[PDB]
Design a protein around this ligand. Sequence first.
Ligand SMILES: [Cl-]
Ligand SMILES: [Zn+2]
Length: 257
Amino acid sequence: HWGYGKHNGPEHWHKDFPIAKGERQSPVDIDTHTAKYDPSLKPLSVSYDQATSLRILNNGHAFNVEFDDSQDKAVLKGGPLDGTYRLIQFHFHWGSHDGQGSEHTVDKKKYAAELHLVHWNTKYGDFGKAVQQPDGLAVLGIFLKVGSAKPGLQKVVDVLDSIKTKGKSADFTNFDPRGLLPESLDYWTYPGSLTTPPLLECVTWIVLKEPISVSSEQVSKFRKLNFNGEGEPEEPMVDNWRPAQPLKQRQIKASFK
Ligand SMILES: [Cl-]
Ligand SMILES: [Zn+2]
């Protein structure tokens, strides 16, 4: 089974998932000098007022906050997207220390972590059908940098102690993901893939320019989670990120100059 270790980590995924060497893999390094301004890209429309969070789960790879995606007003649209995409879950990737942990990089700079807000294209009926199409999902990626604390993240970080091992979960209602967004919605966009197996090339990536600031203590709580199930010897959940992949024949566009 895949993981992030020496023997089952990202360098090994291609054996079970040959698309790992595909033409539209994620993440990627974003070169700010070559990314091209496209002043025809509409503002991003992020509507989370009626986002209805359900639970938080340690899935053995990261933790996912799951949403009720029948909420037809809880949607991402605009920007580079046609039609409407529904929020299903968000999760993070992070490092064994503050100097690494993001999946996308910006001019080769890695951030302490990266948040992914996963949405599926309503035109395909559900998430399971959408992942089989090239315009099936839209993932909103947001970098975390160490600085002042992020108040809207605190409810997430405080609940992690009770879901420390694989399989554990907690009810997690009335979490408002708007508390995780930076001031600015300027972004870079490119077509790419899920960054975990099955690595399907079904994602329009929308990566915000502006990181959110989280405190050193908040991010260190991510690192207290464990990959293993209860009753195995603790295996700290850190460095669950996939490194930058070849950009091949893709152009990264920017919503801003
Ligand atoms: Cl804290
Ligand atoms: Zn992710």
